[PDB]
Amino acid sequence: NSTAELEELLMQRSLTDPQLQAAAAAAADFRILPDATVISIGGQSVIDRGRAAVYPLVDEIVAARKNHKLLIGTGAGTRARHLYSIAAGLGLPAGVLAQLGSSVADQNAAMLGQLLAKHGIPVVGGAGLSAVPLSLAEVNAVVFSGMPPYKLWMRPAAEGVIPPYRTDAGCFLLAEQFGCKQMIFVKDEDGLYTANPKTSKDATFIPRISVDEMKAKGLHDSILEFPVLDLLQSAQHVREVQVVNGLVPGNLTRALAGEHVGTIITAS
Amino acid sequence: NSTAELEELLMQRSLTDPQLQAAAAAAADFRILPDATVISIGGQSVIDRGRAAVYPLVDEIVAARKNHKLLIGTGAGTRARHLYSIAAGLGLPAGVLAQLGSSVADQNAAMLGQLLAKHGIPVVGGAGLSAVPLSLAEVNAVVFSGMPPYKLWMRPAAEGVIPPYRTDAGCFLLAEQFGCKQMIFVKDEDGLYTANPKTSKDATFIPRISVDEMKAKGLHDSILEFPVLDLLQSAQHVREVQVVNGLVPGNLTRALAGEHVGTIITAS
Amino acid sequence: RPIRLLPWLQVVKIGGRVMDRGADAILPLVEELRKLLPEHRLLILTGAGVRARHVFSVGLDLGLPVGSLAPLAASEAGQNGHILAAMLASEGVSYVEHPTVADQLAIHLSATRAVVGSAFPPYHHHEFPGSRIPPHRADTGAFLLADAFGAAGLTIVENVDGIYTADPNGPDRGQARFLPETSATDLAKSEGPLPVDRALLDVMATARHIERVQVVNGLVPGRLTAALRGEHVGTLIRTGVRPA
Amino acid sequence: RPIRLLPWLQVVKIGGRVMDRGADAILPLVEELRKLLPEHRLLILTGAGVRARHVFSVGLDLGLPVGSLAPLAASEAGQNGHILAAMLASEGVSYVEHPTVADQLAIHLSATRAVVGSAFPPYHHHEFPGSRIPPHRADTGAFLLADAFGAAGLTIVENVDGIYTADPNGPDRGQARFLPETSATDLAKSEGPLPVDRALLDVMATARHIERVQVVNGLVPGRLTAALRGEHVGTLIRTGVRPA
Amino acid sequence: RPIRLLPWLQVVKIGGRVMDRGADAILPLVEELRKLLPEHRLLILTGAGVRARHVFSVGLDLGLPVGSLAPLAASEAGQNGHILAAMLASEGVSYVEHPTVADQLAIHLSATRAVVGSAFPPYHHHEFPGSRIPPHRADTGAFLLADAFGAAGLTIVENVDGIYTADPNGPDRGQARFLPETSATDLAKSEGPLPVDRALLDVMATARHIERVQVVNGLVPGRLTAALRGEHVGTLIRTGVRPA
């Protein structure tokens, strides 16, 4: 209601107080990079496939940055699964596995960045992400590693030691924090199907679906990491995502032009 | 022959296997910064000489970056020789001397960078060289320290504790790794002579020579660090270098315009 | 379940509001900690306190999202940690940062008897959305660390005796009843303020090692010493992990 | 010759392919290392293994030069080092990075009995040209470190008994004869695969202190212990440095 | 007055020009330091010497301001520190950088008996204007550190016996009289060269703990040992801090 009322509660109450939480919710909402688009590139589904998959996407990135501002995050892939399997067999906790997976996503960001270096597009990192503002303004794109920085403080899943917040969640959380206008997941299928199209003959394509409808039909952990769907329902800025096939030439260019290729998943 | 055959050998054989080495040699060859030129500025021969040598070269760099993309590495000079002499008298190994020499090359890069800062040209470093892509794209030039990062893991020479891979080798290896189109050494002589022109009356100028011809006439360790000539013969991208006099006004500008001032040394 | 990385470690979390009282509270606490160094191997983690409320007030007025506010509050927990370590420097105690805690804590606890760090986790601009107040704060980060290490315990040092049925310094203070013992699931089903992060109860539900956490009054000398010996002098919180 | 910086140090290099076998090989090795901590001052360095082959496969398909592939493989040796250090954390052992090894190893070996690092050298984008496979790998980097420090020895822990006249797991395995002892110059004149980097033989020719390096089977418990006492249980490689 | 952070610490500053003499001076000094390790807890800080004069000569010819020249000279003090630490590495001594000295000195002095650092302060491009020569150099930085820690003493190791009434190696050397004892205020009122920074006298006027600093000849073995025991073997400088 008032700034003086919010500041009095902030000084006199615990941060857990529902009265304080409700007053903070009425604060104004500033978007840091409202005109940027975050693009997640799959590790196992794209980058691990090599030249045939990566080279056409590099061409699309160079072409797209003429009219679009892009933040491009990389997945991890089969090298992370090997590390997870070694470490899990030793009894190491989820927080140790999270550090191991971050280094694989760093590898993939470095390989992509070297194919883009002659176009001026850099690889960025650090806890401050301090190279993002200047690079976006001058060359309209940056490359970053998709893994979140939780490391040993990673929240475990209810079962097992596989970290539940990986490169899909990391990319999404950056889009939500920066107040970006669009979030696009680039993988190796046309979109969401009623079942895994690799292991089922009769899967049916789904062009548009809500998170609740996905849970009601057993798709909570399908083409996206399951925590992404829950974060999507809590989000303030990014209330839908789009999943597209990166192996189809021009699919990323057309998604950025507002064509409805792939599947659109809405928070509500 | 095939990607599947290379990947089978990569999984089943030691990396020392000649069959694996031969299959890896047939891989495609990507150049990271094919349109850039690396320029090495001598420490003892140029920067240690002060204003009379450095100020005209600063003017040439500012003028050249209008039509050329430049990576400018600095040598070390007389302060490194003093450190090498102290440390050698104590019996310290080559790996310790290499760390001491790197700090002197850092000093010279910082001094040059401050004369260029108002033109937008930065000093770059770090194991990732992550500031190179954006700077080259926007201001067409960067400054870096020429010393390699080997430090304690520096390969010793066959005799003595002086590190054999210093700022000449460091600059060359960066040109070769980035797939640059040109490598220019800037020192204080017109080029290679049949003997040291400072200590011999009748030295004759050599405009063009191969590495094998240099060894056959006793010039293996002349105006360039001797390992540079061996690295040149192994190189994939940079198969010749040019040595020019930095004390002659406009010599760097004219070398960048394709004039054959100085000496051209070819791998074969 | 996963193995224990540092099974002999005791973790102690110091509340920001305790540090906010200045020398009157810090000096007796420092003297108690000094006497504990020969008895336990300690990781001491500090919370944020009132300065985080001020930066929340400025940042929320500027409209900043929750991913911006989280590292601003963690910086204040780091400053409390530098202050506490300076008072213990003559005993060999230094402050160490997030990257050192995650990778080199073992060698630091071999060089010296105790280490000081920040209790906030490094969630940075990847904090969860939903509330405009960062949810993963000092209680939550300290528990995440202690359970991942498989430490022998975590003790939370507060400016009140423990958890009450209502804020003992608030409007309904007259109806506040002290809770000697409770469970994380019982607290999570309640509504109203608590002295600990709500997200602490969530990470307790997925814990793998730590079975109980005690909240004690750091303004009464001797209670931290007793809690580290397992004596019941505050509120015990059962996490839900079952013993063998 | 130059002085010895750490004359009392024992260096141990663990092969990437040993770590690739998982708990079945790592747990007995960890138990043997634990028992060695009170007997020797150890610098433990890890190699890269099969994950470096996969990143070589992707990077070579993308056309990347050898200066790009070298730090990508070194990252996998770092991950093996984090895994091994986590298993030894309860003994006070942590992983440390390249800048710490080159400048602060002496104080770290005073705080604790052993330190874990990566065996790859930090050649980064300054790797030598010639082959499309980075030549200065884990065996080479470990020897460079051990000789520069003037350490008392370097022992290489492999997944085979030692060096044979041919690959004992390859096509010509039937003709493979075990070599109890050899010299670096004799190996350098041969053609065919080896269990150690070819560049290891080159840096052995310019060595200043280390006279012999033994390659032993880390899958047989007790052999690392015996090698650190100078018992002959694998292949001995003479470097060419002469004794006094 | 403020409390003492490390009341048991002895600080020793080694002049750059002492290190410039090479092995003939460094080897006896290293042997004396080695024998002091079991007797004192030492922070050893190195000055810059003649290489800083050369970089001043090049930088002043290029026109660079005093904020550019200051970190260039501090780099040379760092190199002297790496050299000295390498000679002491077998005793567990390593070099540590400015951020480590300011925040983690306490844990480093618990892991090992002595630590080596640079004597120059990190004033970087924020050096004071006025003279074209950086005023806050190695003597000044070492005193600032020692007084802020409340250390038990600071001893300055020089290439002359102490302070004279004129340069004992200069034009007026014939009139140079040795000063066994003096005060900082008396020196500040004089004109002419000194063996210590002029800014050292300024920070002595605002000191809170250290009452005296002795300047001794590091080229005479045994004098550093005697000075650390409070014996009068050089020039004593009274700072102006009063005892209880």
Next chain:
Amino acid sequence: RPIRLLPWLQVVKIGGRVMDRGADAILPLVEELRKLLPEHRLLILTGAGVRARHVFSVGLDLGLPVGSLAPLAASEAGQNGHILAAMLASEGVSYVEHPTVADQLAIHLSATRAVVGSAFPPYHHHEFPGSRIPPHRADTGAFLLADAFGAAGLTIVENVDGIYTADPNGPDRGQARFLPETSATDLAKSEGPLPVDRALLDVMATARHIERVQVVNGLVPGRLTAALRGEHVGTLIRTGVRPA
């Protein structure tokens, strides 16, 4: 009340009858103790067991007084202590005798993490008259030591779960009810056998520091570890000393 001499010490008393079961009980106990060394500073004291009953049988048949029987039984507690220390020797643990415990325990606990001694007191031929069985045995001596030092606790490791209302291995075993908690004055007013010396209850009445003693089953791995953290896994005995 008197000051605490070693306030950070944990005392652990191992029953003679536990040691009498041989390797089947000793090996798991030794492994648990080994894991406790990095967590606590331990004084481990052993009781006598069945061999003291045999020497009582021979000595009582010879007519010997209680002052003769007391050192004969204490010798058997010393032998159990030599056996336990030999199993821990590789961890730096040695056995020490009565004169060393009374005068030099402080320096021995600085050299190593744990020390083994005998639980019997040195009453020798000055044992009290009255019963023909020496009254001041292993439980009594361990408590006397722990209270005089002002130690942080004493834990008694038995071959049963705790104290019952009757002998759980005797004739009335069917009526034996387990006692989770009791007081020394309540036990002293009862008649019948106990698992602890009757004289232990007497010295508890005059204690100055120790408020509680827990009796736990040493044949169940993990219970000693839990008791040293103050978890309730056996019978708690309240001594009568009041807390602050």
